[PDB]
């Protein structure tokens with residue numbers, strides 16, 4: 001133990017994937033961040049040619065996010081389904097980092113996907129069926145009846161189950177999908193507290209810790225590009 005615990009590596013790798021995704025958003029995009037929360041990705045949006053709408057259901061967290069909100073960011077307090085109905089923005093990129101499993105637990109996965117704007121997207125989602133059993137001093141996922149118990153540091157969150165399989169099958173109806181894991185992250189997070197020496201120390205710990213690789217393998221990433229328009233019947237016409 002020396003600043004190098006399971007929760008520490010997880011947030012750093014999470015920070016790694018957000019750095020790459022936000023950077024890879026096309027220039028001048030109108031972005032929707034579903035679950036903007038307390039504003040961790042503000043500094044990454046602030047240094048970029050992007051118009052961003054951050055939506056959350058928690059006002060207390062959107063209050064922490066306003067205390068240092070970049071001006072290219074607009075904050076709105078409405079969940080995803082209300083906002084998609086009411087908004088006048090046409091979005092060109094969707095971001096959802098550790099957020100979509102909440103709406104997916106109270107909706108049909110095909111309804112969430114068809115309601116998402118038809119635009120490129122990046123999704124980080126925990127797959128609790130790939131995380132159950134992992135018990136480390138700072139990270140633990142355990143089953144509790146129909147609900148999931150997850151402990152980060154000492155935070156004791158309860159999350160509900162969602163249908164990952166149907167979700168992935170619905171994305172395949174709309175998107176070219178490349179699936180991945182946090183374990184596939186190499187790029188150094190933009191977080192300035194993560195020095196080059198510390199990142200190397202984190203990635204070396206991943207190469208030599210089984211528990212860590214399991215935690216990282218259970219945080220599933222989705223790089224989405226919209227399929228061609230239903231006029232894909234022309235290509236099937238080559239059968």
Ligand SMILES: Nc1ncnc2c1ncn2[C@@H]1O[C@H](CSCC[C@H](N)C(=O)O)[C@@H](O)[C@H]1O
Pocket residue numbers: 034035036037038039040041055056057058061078079080081096097098099102103
């Ligand atoms: N249906 C919903 N619509 C929008 N935001 C939601 C939501 N359900 C939960 N959220 C928000 O999603 C967030 C996930 S945690 C914060 C995630 C943030 N993207 C980050 O990277 O730090 C929470 O703040 C939660 O309030």
Ligand code: NA
Pocket residue numbers: 023024025026027
């Ligand atoms: Na670019």
